[PDB]
Amino acid sequence: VLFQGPGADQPIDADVTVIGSGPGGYVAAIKAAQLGFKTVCIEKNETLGGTCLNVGCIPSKALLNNSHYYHMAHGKDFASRGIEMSEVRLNLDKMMEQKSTAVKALTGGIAHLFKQNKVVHVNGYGKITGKNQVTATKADGGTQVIDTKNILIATGSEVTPFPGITIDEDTIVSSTGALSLKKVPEKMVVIGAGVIGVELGSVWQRLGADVTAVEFLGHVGGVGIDMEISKNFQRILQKQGFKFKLNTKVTGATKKSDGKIDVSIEAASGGKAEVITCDVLLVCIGRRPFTKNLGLEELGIELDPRGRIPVNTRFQTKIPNIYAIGDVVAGPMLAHKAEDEGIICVEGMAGGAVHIDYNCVPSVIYTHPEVAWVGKSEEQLKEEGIEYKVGKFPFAANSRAKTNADTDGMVKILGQKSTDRVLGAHILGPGAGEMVNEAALALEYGASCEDIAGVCHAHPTLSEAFREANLAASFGKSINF
Amino acid sequence: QPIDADVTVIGSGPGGYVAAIKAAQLGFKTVCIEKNETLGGTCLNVGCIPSKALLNNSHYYHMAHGKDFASRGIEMSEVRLNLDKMMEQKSTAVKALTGGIAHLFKQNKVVHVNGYGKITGKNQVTATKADGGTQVIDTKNILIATGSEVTPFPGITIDEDTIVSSTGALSLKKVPEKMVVIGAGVIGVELGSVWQRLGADVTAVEFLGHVGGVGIDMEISKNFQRILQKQGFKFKLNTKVTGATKKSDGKIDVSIEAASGGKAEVITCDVLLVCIGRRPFTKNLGLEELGIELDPRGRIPVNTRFQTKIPNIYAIGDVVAGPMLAHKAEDEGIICVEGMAGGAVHIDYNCVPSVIYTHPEVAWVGKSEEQLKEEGIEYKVGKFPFAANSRAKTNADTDGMVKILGQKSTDRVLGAHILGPGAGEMVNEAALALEYGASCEDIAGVCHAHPTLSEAFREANLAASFGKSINF
Numbered sequence: 001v002l003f004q005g006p007g008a009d010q011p012i013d014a015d016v017t018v019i020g021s022g023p024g025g026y027v028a029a030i031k032a033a034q035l036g037f038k039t040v041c042i043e044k045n046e047t048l049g050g051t052c053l054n055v056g057c058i059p060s061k062a063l064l065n066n067s068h069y070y071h072m073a074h075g076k077d078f079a080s081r082g083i084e085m086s087e088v089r090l091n092l093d094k095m096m097e098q099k100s101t102a103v104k105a106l107t108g109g110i111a112h113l114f115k116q117n118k119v120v121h122v123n124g125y126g127k128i129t130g131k132n133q134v135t136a137t138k139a140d141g142g143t144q145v146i147d148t149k150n151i152l153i154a155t156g157s158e159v160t161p162f163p164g165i166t167i168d169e170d171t172i173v174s175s176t177g178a179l180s181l182k183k184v185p186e187k188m189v190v191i192g193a194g195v196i197g198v199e200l201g202s203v204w205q206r207l208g209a210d211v212t213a214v215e216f217l218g219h220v221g222g223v224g225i226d227m228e229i230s231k232n233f234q235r236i237l238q239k240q241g242f243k244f245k246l247n248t249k250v251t252g253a254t255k256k257s258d259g260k261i262d263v264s265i266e267a268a269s270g271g272k273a274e275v276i277t278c279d280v281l282l283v284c285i286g287r288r289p290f291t292k293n294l295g296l297e298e299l300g301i302e303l304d305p306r307g308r309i310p311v312n313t314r315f316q317t318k319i320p321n322i323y324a325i326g327d328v329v330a331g332p333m334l335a336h337k338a339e340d341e342g343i344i345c346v347e348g349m350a351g352g353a354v355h356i357d358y359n360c361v362p363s364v365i366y367t368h369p370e371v372a373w374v375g376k377s378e379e380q381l382k383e384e385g386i387e388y389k390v391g392k393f394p395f396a397a398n399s400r401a402k403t404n405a406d407t408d409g410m411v412k413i414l415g416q417k418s419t420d421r422v423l424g425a426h427i428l429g430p431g432a433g434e435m436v437n438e439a440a441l442a443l444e445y446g447a448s449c450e451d452i453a454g455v456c457h458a459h460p461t462l463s464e465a466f467r468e469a470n471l472a473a474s475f476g477k478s479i480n481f
Numbered sequence: 482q483p484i485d486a487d488v489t490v491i492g493s494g495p496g497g498y499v500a501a502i503k504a505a506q507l508g509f510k511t512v513c514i515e516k517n518e519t520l521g522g523t524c525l526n527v528g529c530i531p532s533k534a535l536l537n538n539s540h541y542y543h544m545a546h547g548k549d550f551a552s553r554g555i556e557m558s559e560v561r562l563n564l565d566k567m568m569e570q571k572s573t574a575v576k577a578l579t580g581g582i583a584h585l586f587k588q589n590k591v592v593h594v595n596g597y598g599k600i601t602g603k604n605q606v607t608a609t610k611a612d613g614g615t616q617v618i619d620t621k622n623i624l625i626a627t628g629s630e631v632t633p634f635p636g637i638t639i640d641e642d643t644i645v646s647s648t649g650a651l652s653l654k655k656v657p658e659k660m661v662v663i664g665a666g667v668i669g670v671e672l673g674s675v676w677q678r679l680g681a682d683v684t685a686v687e688f689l690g691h692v693g694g695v696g697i698d699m700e701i702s703k704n705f706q707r708i709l710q711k712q713g714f715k716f717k718l719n720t721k722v723t724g725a726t727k728k729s730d731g732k733i734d735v736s737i738e739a740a741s742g743g744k745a746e747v748i749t750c751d752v753l754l755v756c757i758g759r760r761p762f763t764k765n766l767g768l769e770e771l772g773i774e775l776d777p778r779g780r781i782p783v784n785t786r787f788q789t790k791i792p793n794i795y796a797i798g799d800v801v802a803g804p805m806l807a808h809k810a811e812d813e814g815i816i817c818v819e820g821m822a823g824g825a826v827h828i829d830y831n832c833v834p835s836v837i838y839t840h841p842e843v844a845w846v847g848k849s850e851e852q853l854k855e856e857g858i859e860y861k862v863g864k865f866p867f868a869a870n871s872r873a874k875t876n877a878d879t880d881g882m883v884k885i886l887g888q889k890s891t892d893r894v895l896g897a898h899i900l901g902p903g904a905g906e907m908v909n910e911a912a913l914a915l916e917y918g919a920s921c922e923d924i925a926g927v928c929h930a931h932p933t934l935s936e937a938f939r940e941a942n943l944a945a946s947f948g949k950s951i952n953f
């Protein structure tokens with residue numbers, strides 16, 4: 001009953017039909033059921049959980065964690081603590097096994113949560129075949145009709161191809177291939193110095209690869225990152241051994257008879273042609289919304305120029321019982337962003353209020369040091385003409401960071417010049433990813449720098465650097481720097 | 482000859498040194514007197530900093546020497562402990578941070594006077610240096626920040642050789658074969674776990690029925706103890722120590738019995754760590770001559786501006802009531818000197834977090850289930866296990882849970898209790914929530930980054946507010 005795979009082809013009735021089981025879709029489906037909707041979730045892949053669980057956040061963070069520890073043991077860190085080892089060897093098969101075990105446990109966990117919440121899981125390719133109808137086509141050629149009051153499109157994203165360079169997941173890989181390399185490549189080129197490219201580059205650099213990322217724009221870490229943070233981050237990564245060719249375009253790549261790859265590059269504006277050689281080429285120039293063969297054209301739901309489905313503040317498409325959330329709509333392509341939109345979307349279906357402040361959605365890069373930010377960058381505040389002040393506190397002056405010999409970076413707080421309102425929080429250093437959620441909570445309430453400075457933060461913690469940067473922004477001066 | 486000052490701070494621990502810096506930043510001509518050879522007090526020199534350094538280093542030793550790294554494909558043939566080097570890393574951190582305080586004093590024009598400070602008049606402090614030389618400070622206000630000392634165990638003499646306080650245990654020269662810990666509070670569990678990881682056979686003996694000290698939630702404490710026992714840390718709860726004998730062969734015979742009486746036995750160890758408590762330190766400060774009486778536990782009573790009964794003489798930190806924690810002392814110091822300058826003075830001690838830096842960590846803020854039951858408060862519970870958290874699962878580090886206690890009628894968060902990875906950092910988001918009077922629904926609606934451990938905090942609040950989390 002709760003699983004409808006090949007051979008289960010009876011017609012189904014539902015209140016809410018969710019197409020896709022990524023962070024947006026599977027959370028929307030659970031919550032819709034908890035709200036009392038008869039809920040169906042359609043997924044074409046053999047496991048639930050979408051991009052993030054299967055080929056995304058989860059496997060990448062596992063390899064970031066394990067490769068950091070390899071670096072701690074293999075490099076200078078453990079020796080400096082009196083932990084003396086004869087020979088530190090990499091067993092990549094086992095490291096990859098730890099990654100795969102986490103993914104399996106969590107995709108099985110979604111299946112369990114669907115059963116616990118009475119979500120009907122239809123395994124098949126969903127196509128919208130009427131304003132109130134979704135048809136799922138299964139692996140055996142069977143079809144199953146779902147008559148449904150509401151439809152929630154959560155069909156996610158795909159890798160953006162690079163014209164003329166064919167990803168084969170062998171020597172020319174997407175993030176998916178790069179998460180499962182069978183051996184550490186001697187040299188790797190990464191096209192795109194965005195979040196995903198920097199994370200995957202750092203993983204393989206730690207494990208022994210010579211890594212260069214080639215990026216068309218003039219900074220690392222993607223859109224909206226604060227420029228000071230990005231420059232300092234880049235400098236720290238270069239000191240680790242991660243090389244960057246910014247303001248550079250790739251014009252082509254050739255797989256050679258010796259098995260290596262020649263990548264032709266030039267200045268982004270033109271000139272300075274060069275060739276660089278690698279063993280593995282990772283193509284991560286972007287990701288884009290996935291709506292293939294969903295029936296949107298026949299419904300009249302037109303896409304925006306970038307392939308996104310336009311929606312209103314309730315996440316309704318122009319057809320008011322058909323909704324869309326997550327990577328298939330505008331906004332940052334992030335798992336927690338998709339999840340939050342899914343929840344508020346189905347809460348709205350049930351009569352509740354619908355509101356999300358995208359100024360309060362954090363971004364995180366899970367390198368070491370981590371990078372995390374929420375709210376506005378300095379460049380954004382300048383663009384918008386908003387007057388602001390700055391407080392900074394370096395982790396070199398934080399007691400927890402210093403005691404652990406882990407002192408890269410700073411916290412930077414941007415406050416409104418006259419009102420002391422926190423406008424943005426930018427963290428470069430240990431624990432940034434966890435710390436930014438304290439900032440997100442402050443932004444929710446419209447808190448001031450003075451507010452945060454008055455909160456008693458535990459000593460010794462990295463979070464004290466966040467407190468002190470807010471004190472500096474509010475009073476002009478921190479205590480410990 | 483005499484120094485003239487607006488504010489004279491006696492003691493340079495977390496309360497005093499922060500108070501001195503802030504007072505100078507507010508425009509007070511400020512003096513800080515310290516009797517010890519370095520600044521930073523108990524926390525920097527024999528407290529938080531060396532203890533967290535050995536906790537970090539011993540945890541990493543455990544990961545390399547045990548099963549954890551091998552399961553990640555990080556294969557090492559022989560993992561050996563160099564305790565001398567581990568202690569050097571600890572000492573290097575302490576040295577750097579105590580030097581940082583001296584630099585900050587210079588940066589902020591805080592005059593550092595080295596000596597034993599005695600209040601010798603309502604407006605005068607005299608510092609006596611080790612050779613008997615004196616420095617008199619004539620001062621408008623005096624801020625007592627003289628801190629704490631170890632609480633002795635009657636009949637057992639700590640000598641920092643085989644019977645140690647936390648100070649001796651932070652600098653043992655070799656791993657003891659067998660160590661007994663008197664007191665399973667925060668300090669004892671931390672230092673016991675350090676030495677257990679490094680190879681010692683460790684038993685903590687505790688008079689009461691739970692570990693982790695006053696105010697810890699009982700469910701959290703029981704689950705925490707279960708995890709530590711699985712690691713190899715042994716506990717004798719509901720057990721009293723009646724005496725300890727230093728033997729001719731250098732070992733220690735410890736006599737114990739059931740806390741209520743009966744079941745006498747003797748256990749033998751190489752090192753006995755005595756950590757039953759800490760107590761305020763005011764010795765030879767001149768309080769009796771001024772007429773400043775102590776409360777029955779030795780604390781200086783103060784008003785909400787931290788004034789003693791002599792209103793230009795103040796006290797903050799471990800020498801006054803409230804939780805004996807570094808961040809508590811620092812906040813009291815800051816607001817005390819802000820008050821001297823005319824500003825508002827508020828601290829909500831229900832919003833002061835506690836952290837135990839074991840692995841797993843423990844951290845909490847607000848009220849325990851037991852405190853709410855005592856006070857007659859009607860509440861609801863939300864729980865979320867780290868086994869269901871994506872970041873924890875991805876790191877293969879899934880012990881524990883977040884437990885949220887909410888008010889039934891208003892949905893206000895009354896308490897947050899975390900057992901597991903990242904608890905110490907996570908509790909600061911919880912302290913912000915309590916300071917702001919957040920509801921469980923508030924936190925559940927805040928977009929937390931995915932995957933982060935903090936999502937367990939979000940989900941436990943969702944469970945308390947709505948009745949059900951998403952991922953469990």
Ligand SMILES: Cc1cc2nc3c(=O)[nH]c(=O)nc-3n(C[C@H](O)[C@H](O)[C@H](O)COP(=O)(O)OP(=O)(O)OC[C@H]3O[C@@H](n4cnc5c(N)ncnc54)[C@H](O)[C@@H]3O)c2cc1C
Nearest residue numbers: 020022023024044050051052126156157326327333334335
């Ligand atoms: C390498 C990598 C690392 C990342 N790391 C992070 C990170 O640390 N943090 C973060 O927040 N984000 C991260 N992301 C991004 C994150 O994975 C996405 O933002 C998120 O998965 C989007 O969720 P979604 O539910 O919108 O879409 P998706 O996760 O893409 O899920 C869509 C699902 O719908 C299914 N589907 C599509 N069409 C149909 C159809 N017609 N019928 C049936 N099923 C269909 C697909 O098979 C898929 O399972 C990362 C991404 C990558 C690639």
Ligand SMILES: Cc1cc2nc3c(=O)[nH]c(=O)nc-3n(C[C@H](O)[C@H](O)[C@H](O)COP(=O)(O)OP(=O)(O)OC[C@H]3O[C@@H](n4cnc5c(N)ncnc54)[C@H](O)[C@@H]3O)c2cc1C
Nearest residue numbers: 492494495496516522523528598628629798799805806807
């Ligand atoms: C092993 C251990 C671990 C700890 N870990 C933590 C932790 O992780 N987190 C936490 O929050 N707390 C921790 N604490 C508690 C923390 O150390 C104290 O709460 C904090 O140090 C109190 O600060 P204070 O400024 O009030 O006093 P203290 O730090 O005790 O400083 C008092 C100072 O005054 C000096 N002094 C006293 N009398 C005079 C005098 N007459 N003249 C001159 N100088 C004088 C002393 O020499 C000392 O330097 C720990 C304590 C111990 C023992």
